[PDB]
Ligand binder design. Structure first.
Ligand SMILES: NC(=O)c1ccc[n+]([C@@H]2O[C@H](COP(=O)([O-])OP(=O)(O)OC[C@H]3O[C@@H](n4cnc5c(N)ncnc54)[C@H](O)[C@@H]3O)[C@@H](O)[C@@H]2F)c1
Lengths: 138, 237, 424
């Protein structure tokens, strides 16, 4: 879903005011909005206009494609429940450490510690992922 | 310049201040610096300011007594103890370098905030006025201050004074310096270059000219309470 | 796909840490209260993602402003903006400490003060209260699309922060950018610029115009804040605004050169602005570049607790005298105890230190004065008093003449030190 549109960013490269930009400045407009598209991805979506201009209705549909929606809250919760066999709603720091150290993207051991300390507010060594996700999303 | 010193003495004998002979000359200087406060930010980098000022004064045959981190009552007592020093009756001048967090009324003590602890600028002149301090009467009394952020009796009792105040609102908020303070750095710099071919007031004006940089233009050292009836010439030896 | 859930958890925790840092900044910042960009204090110990949301919102605000100020864009301005948007950044952190060990681990002032790690502290009390950016690691910004030697610039706000420069080439997903230092929004004059020769020899009027307060629409104290998505757009728009305001047609023609080289672009950027990038909490990575810009001094190696430079420099006991004096003067009690363990100091060593006019502290202060100035050196004092190196009741002769270590202890209000002096 979209509420606030990217018309202002599109308008900066709209030289004539006709509502179109050249295809070469497509990646520039997206990068100005935080989206970094690959040259290969820029070309396959350029094929939509087969002239060298891109209109805002076509650009607006391009942005929604590479939206990269952040992980939803329930998607966060399910990610924690797959590392909890007992179903008690708790994960030990070591269990969380073994997960993050040996699974997923490789990070430095100091990054894993700063994350575990951030999750264990109590200091008891146990992490209640349910309370934390409910605490972060509010 | 030794030949010029004799030349300036005879040319202007009633227009310049007298100079004691190097024998039987006990010229004293006092440096009062507050770098660490109880309820105020510390003035870091003062180790350089104290050093650069102690060397320049000693290079001018001044015995520097450095006092550091004194409350206002101690600073007042130190100034009174510096005026009662019998070694000033054998001198021609003196220098007062007080460096601390200072409001417009005066310099602040270490304990100073709701509770006040300030040495009023006027109190320094009273301790060294021509009535309370006769040992330095008719003698130039320089006062250099580095602060952060009838009444006709005073016109007559306060003689032979000169102040060169710096009120840069640094407050470790400008937070842009290289191993010391700009005012002290430029003051030493101008004293190295223009002190041999100018009198004391010219050297101060030369320092004010240095602050012509766009961001450092309003950082003008203010001259205050000038009470000198003669031109004070410092000679390089 | 179990790894995907682990990556989800990792991204969630990184986002949480960033939210904490930004909540600290926006809630404990008084300048944020003057403007209406202040945030609520978290009732819980942690903070929700609202802080992060706030950041985004704040970003848009400033973007909006500058857009409305310069929305009619010339072809030259549009081409320059297109150049800036497609430019990548190198982020540089200078230090006199060893932060790399095949892994770069830089930490913020808050995290350092938390673990009580020993190092030099360049943030001050006023920055912490007014901005509260002390849970962020700070970097200077350079253009990265070049083949020249990587440390292009070495001074941020006319300040050299160390010989060891650590450079990263990847943006942080939760860092924020300011056109100047967040606390000091003043562009210093060209007199202090590292690359003054370029602008002085090639340009004329911009030399006077560059010294300014980079502010928003609310006033001088309004320091524009951007996030990683809006960094390049805001930087380009503010650069276009400055170039349009300027009257040196040579500077405008040089900036609007359609085929401008990246080194000249970086010159213009680090001249007109002094970009500053901020990463929450700590930066720990394996992709970094370390460049030793110069040699470090003994005092600078001690203030930064650089044990290896200290071990390289302190080879004899005269160097041990110098190092002990510098350690006392900088409250580096850890380095002082390390030196007392490596070398044996006696009363003769203390006397030779008192005769040491090359050292600033020993020239100004007595050894006893340095031992008793701050409580952070208490243990050293203990070692000096219990082993006979320094005589209690010694009356100071250099600074604060006539006083004793008991008086400095009274001034420090450190109960342990006063008690130890009273008992001995
Ligand atoms: N450094 C650089 O380059 C810069 C840039 C820009 C800016 N700056 C400035 O500066 C200031 C601050 O400083 P710095 O950045 O350096 O930070 P600080 O606060 O001081 O803290 C931190 C420190 O410590 C260390 N560290 C880190 N990490 C660590 C560990 N792990 N250990 C030890 N040490 C350390 C570092 O180096 C620094 O010096 C701020 O305010 C500002 F922003 C800087």
């Amino acid at each position: 879903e979209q509420i606030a549109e990217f018309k202002e960013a599109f308008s900066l490269f709209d030289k004539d005011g006709d509502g179109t930009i050249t295809t070469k400045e497509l990646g520039t407009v997206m990068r100005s909005l935080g989206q970094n598209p690959t040259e290969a991805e820029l070309q396959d979506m350029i094929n939509e206009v087969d002239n060298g201009t891109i209109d805002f209705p076509e650009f607006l549909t391009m942005m929604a494609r590479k939206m990269k929606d952040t992980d939803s809250e329930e998607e966060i919760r399910e990610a924690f429940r797959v590392f909890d066999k007992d179903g008690n709603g708790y994960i030990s720091a070591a269990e969380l450490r073994h997960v993050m150290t040996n699974l997923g993207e490789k990070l430095t051991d100091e990054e894993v510690d700063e994350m575990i300390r951030e999750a264990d507010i109590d200091g008891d060594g146990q992490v209640n992922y349910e309370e934390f996700v409910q605490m972060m999303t509010a | 310049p030794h030949e010029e010193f004799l030349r300036l003495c005879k040319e202007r004998a009633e227009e310049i201040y007298p100079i004691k002979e190097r024998n039987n000359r006990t010229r004293l200087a006092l440096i009062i610096c507050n770098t660490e406060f109880d309820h105020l930010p510390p003035r870091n980098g003062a180790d350089f300011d104290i050093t650069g000022m102690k060397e320049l004064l000693e290079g001018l045959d001044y015995s520097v007594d450095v006092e550091e981190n004194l409350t206002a009552r101690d600073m007042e007592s130190a100034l009174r103890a510096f005026a009662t020093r019998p070694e000033h009756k054998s001198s021609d001048s003196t220098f007062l370098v007080l460096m601390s967090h200072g409001i417009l009324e005066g310099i602040c003590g270490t304990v100073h905030e709701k509770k006040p602890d300030v040495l009023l600028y006027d109190t320094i002149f009273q301790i060294f006025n021509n009535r309370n301090c006769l040992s330095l009467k008719d003698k130039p009394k320089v006062i250099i201050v580095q602060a952060a952020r009838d009444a006709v009796y005073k016109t007559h009792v306060e003689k032979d004074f000169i102040a060169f105040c710096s009120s840069t609102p640094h407050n470790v908020s400008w937070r842009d310096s290289t191993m010391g303070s700009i005012f002290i750095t430029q003051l030493i710099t101008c004293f190295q270059k223009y002190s041999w071919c100018c009198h004391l007031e010219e050297v101060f004006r030369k320092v004010q000219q240095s602050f012509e940089t766009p961001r450092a233009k309003a950082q003008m050292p203010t001259i205050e309470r000038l009470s000198m009836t003669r031109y004070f010439y410092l000679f390089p030896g | 796909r179990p790894d995907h859930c682990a990556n989800t958890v990792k991204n969630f925790l990184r986002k949480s840490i960033a939210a904490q840092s930004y909540s600290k900044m926006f809630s404990q910042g008084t300048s944020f209260k003057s403007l209406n960009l202040s945030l609520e204090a978290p009732s819980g110990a942690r903070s929700s993602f609202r802080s992060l949301e706030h950041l985004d919102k704040v970003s848009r605000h400033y973007i909006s402003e500058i857009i409305q100020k310069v929305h009619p864009l010339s072809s030259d301005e549009r081409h320059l903006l297109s150049i800036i948007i497609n430019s990548n950044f190198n982020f540089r952190h200078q230090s006199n400490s060893n932060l790399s060990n095949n892994i770069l681990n830089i930490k913020s002032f808050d995290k350092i003060q938390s673990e009580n790690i020993q190092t030099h502290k360049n943030t001050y009390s006023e920055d912490i209260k007014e901005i509260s950016n002390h849970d962020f690691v700070f970097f200077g910004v350079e253009i990265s699309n070049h083949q020249e030697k990587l440390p292009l610039n070495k001074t941020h706000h006319t300040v050299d922060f160390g010989a060891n420069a650590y450079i990263i080439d990847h943006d942080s997903p939760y860092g924020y950018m300011t056109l100047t230092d967040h606390f000091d929004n003043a562009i210093p004059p060209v007199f202090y610029h590292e690359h003054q020769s370029f602008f002085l020899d090639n340009f004329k009027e911009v030399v006077d115009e560059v010294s300014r307060y980079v502010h928003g629409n609310q006033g001088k104290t309004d320091v524009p804040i951007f996030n990683t998505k809006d960094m390049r757009l805001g930087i380009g728009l503010h650069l276009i605004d400055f170039i349009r305001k300027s009257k040196d047609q040579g500077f405008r023609e040089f900036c609007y050169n359609k085929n401008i080289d990246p080194v000249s672009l970086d010159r213009i950027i680090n001249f007109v602005f002094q970009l500053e990038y901020h990463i929450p909490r700590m930066l720990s990575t394996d992709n970094f570049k370390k460049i030793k810009l110069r040699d470090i001094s003994l005092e600078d190696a001690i203030k930064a607790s650089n044990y290896e430079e200290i071990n390289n420099k302190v080879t004899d006991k005269k160097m041990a005298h110098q190092a002990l004096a510098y350690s006392l003067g900088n409250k580096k009690a850890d380095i002082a105890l390390y030196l007392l363990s490596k070398f044996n100091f006696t009363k003769q060593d203390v006397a030779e230190m008192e005769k040491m006019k090359n050292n600033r502290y020993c020239n100004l202060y007595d050894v006893e004065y340095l031992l008793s100035k701050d409580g952070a050196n208490y243990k050293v004092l203990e070692y000096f008093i219990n082993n006979g190196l320094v005589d209690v009741n010694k009356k100071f002769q250099k600074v604060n003449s006539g006083d004793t270590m008991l008086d400095n202890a009274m001034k420090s209000k450190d109960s342990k030190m006063i008690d130890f002096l009273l008992k001995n």
